[PDB]
Design an enzyme around this catalytic site. Structure first.
Site, PDB file in Angstrom:
ATOM      1  N   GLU A  62     -19.246 144.558 123.321  1.00 20.28           N
ATOM      2  CA  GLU A  62     -20.544 144.877 123.879  1.00 20.28           C
ATOM      3  C   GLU A  62     -20.659 146.396 124.051  1.00 20.28           C
ATOM      4  O   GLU A  62     -19.695 147.051 124.416  1.00 20.28           O
ATOM      5  CB  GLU A  62     -20.731 144.207 125.238  1.00 20.28           C
ATOM      6  CG  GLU A  62     -22.115 144.399 125.813  1.00 20.28           C
ATOM      7  CD  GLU A  62     -23.248 143.818 124.999  1.00 20.28           C
ATOM      8  OE1 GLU A  62     -23.916 144.603 124.287  1.00 20.28           O
ATOM      9  OE2 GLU A  62     -23.506 142.586 125.129  1.00 20.28           O
ATOM     10  N   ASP A  90     -18.479 139.644 123.874  1.00 18.10           N
ATOM     11  CA  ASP A  90     -18.521 140.804 124.745  1.00 18.10           C
ATOM     12  C   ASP A  90     -17.179 141.553 124.663  1.00 18.10           C
ATOM     13  O   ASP A  90     -17.189 142.759 124.718  1.00 18.10           O
ATOM     14  CB  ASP A  90     -18.856 140.368 126.175  1.00 18.10           C
ATOM     15  CG  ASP A  90     -20.327 140.052 126.394  1.00 18.10           C
ATOM     16  OD1 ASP A  90     -21.148 140.764 125.816  1.00 18.10           O
ATOM     17  OD2 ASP A  90     -20.632 139.106 127.153  1.00 18.10           O
ATOM     18  N   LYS A 116     -24.953 129.073 128.479  1.00 22.11           N
ATOM     19  CA  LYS A 116     -24.157 129.837 127.532  1.00 22.11           C
ATOM     20  C   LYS A 116     -23.298 128.937 126.648  1.00 22.11           C
ATOM     21  O   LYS A 116     -23.059 129.261 125.514  1.00 22.11           O
ATOM     22  CB  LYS A 116     -23.145 130.733 128.247  1.00 22.11           C
ATOM     23  CG  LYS A 116     -23.738 132.000 128.802  1.00 22.11           C
ATOM     24  CD  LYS A 116     -23.865 133.056 127.767  1.00 22.11           C
ATOM     25  CE  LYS A 116     -24.076 134.409 128.404  1.00 22.11           C
ATOM     26  NZ  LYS A 116     -24.820 135.277 127.484  1.00 22.11           N
TER      27      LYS A 116
HETATM   28  C1  G5V Z   1     -27.927 139.553 124.257  1.00 18.02           C
HETATM   29  C2  G5V Z   1     -27.060 139.252 125.243  1.00 18.02           C
HETATM   30  O1  G5V Z   1     -27.605 138.732 126.375  1.00 18.02           O
HETATM   31  C3  G5V Z   1     -26.825 138.386 127.445  1.00 18.02           C
HETATM   32  C4  G5V Z   1     -25.472 138.558 127.397  1.00 18.02           C
HETATM   33  O2  G5V Z   1     -24.666 138.214 128.472  1.00 18.02           O
HETATM   34  C5  G5V Z   1     -24.893 139.100 126.223  1.00 18.02           C
HETATM   35  O3  G5V Z   1     -23.688 139.263 126.155  1.00 18.02           O
HETATM   36  C6  G5V Z   1     -25.683 139.451 125.134  1.00 18.02           C
HETATM   37  C7  G5V Z   1     -25.099 139.993 123.960  1.00 18.02           C
HETATM   38  O4  G5V Z   1     -24.969 141.154 123.678  1.00 18.02           O
HETATM   39  O5  G5V Z   1     -24.612 139.227 123.105  1.00 18.02           O
HETATM   40 MN    MN Z   2     -22.574 138.696 127.749  1.00 18.40          MN
HETATM   41 MN    MN Z   3     -22.841 140.610 124.543  1.00 23.35          MN
END
Ligand code: G5V
Ligand code: MN
Ligand code: MN
Length: 176
Positions: A62, A90, A116
């Site tokens: 990330e 991440d 998720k």
């Molecule tokens: C896009 C995005 O939204 C919420 C998260 O917790 C993420 O890690 C994410 C991402 O960068 O994949």
């Molecule tokens: Mn995330």
């Molecule tokens: Mn992410």
């Protein structure tokens, strides 16, 4: 506006610049979507914090541009054998040899966890809230108690700072 000042005042400038860049690459104005701005900053900070409390145990995915993230993920897969995810996670955990998806939620941790898990397949999931709750795959929390505790304190402090400035009620009822 107050929310925009809060973000600039309470996150280190590297996080702000990263969050800003991301938003305006995708046509989003951080001065308009101020709750989103703050959520992006918050999530990014947790990712960095989680990485920092590792020798080099965690690889950070990330916060890089997509080329570099996918370069990092590709490289990790070829030298470990681990299946390649469909979405950018991440972090990579070099000790446990699994990707991690980090979530930061203002709803109930179990709810966001489901959301998720459903959106993902062998990526470890670790959800934090602004209340000191967490939920993680197989209740494996990855980090030591002190690291987890520093993350939760930081999240609770963002919450209370927002509440000091009457921004929490808006932030809580919004959704990234
Ligand atoms: C896009 C995005 O939204 C919420 C998260 O917790 C993420 O890690 C994410 C991402 O960068 O994949
Ligand atoms: Mn995330
Ligand atoms: Mn992410």
């Amino acid at each position: 506006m107050a929310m925009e000042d809060f973000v600039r005042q309470c996150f280190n400038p590297m996080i702000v610049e990263l969050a800003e860049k991301a938003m305006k690459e995708y046509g989003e104005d951080p001065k308009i979507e101020t709750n989103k701005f703050a959520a992006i900053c918050t999530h990014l900070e947790v990712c960095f914090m989680y990485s920092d409390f590792g020798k080099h145990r965690f690889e950070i995915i990330e916060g890089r541009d997509r080329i570099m993230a996918w370069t990092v993920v590709n490289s990790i897969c070829n030298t470990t054998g681990v299946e390649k995810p469909k979405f950018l996670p991440d972090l990579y955990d070099y000790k446990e040899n699994r990707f991690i998806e980090i979530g930061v939620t203002r709803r109930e941790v179990h709810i966001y966890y489901l959301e998720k898990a459903n959106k993902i397949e062998k990526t470890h999931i670790h959800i934090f809230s602004f209340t000191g709750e967490e939920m993680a795959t197989k209740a494996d929390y990855t980090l030591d108690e002190e690291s987890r505790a520093r993350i939760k304190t930081r999240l609770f402090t963002i919450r209370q700072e927002m509440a000091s400035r009457s921004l929490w009620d808006s932030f809580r009822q919004s959704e990234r």
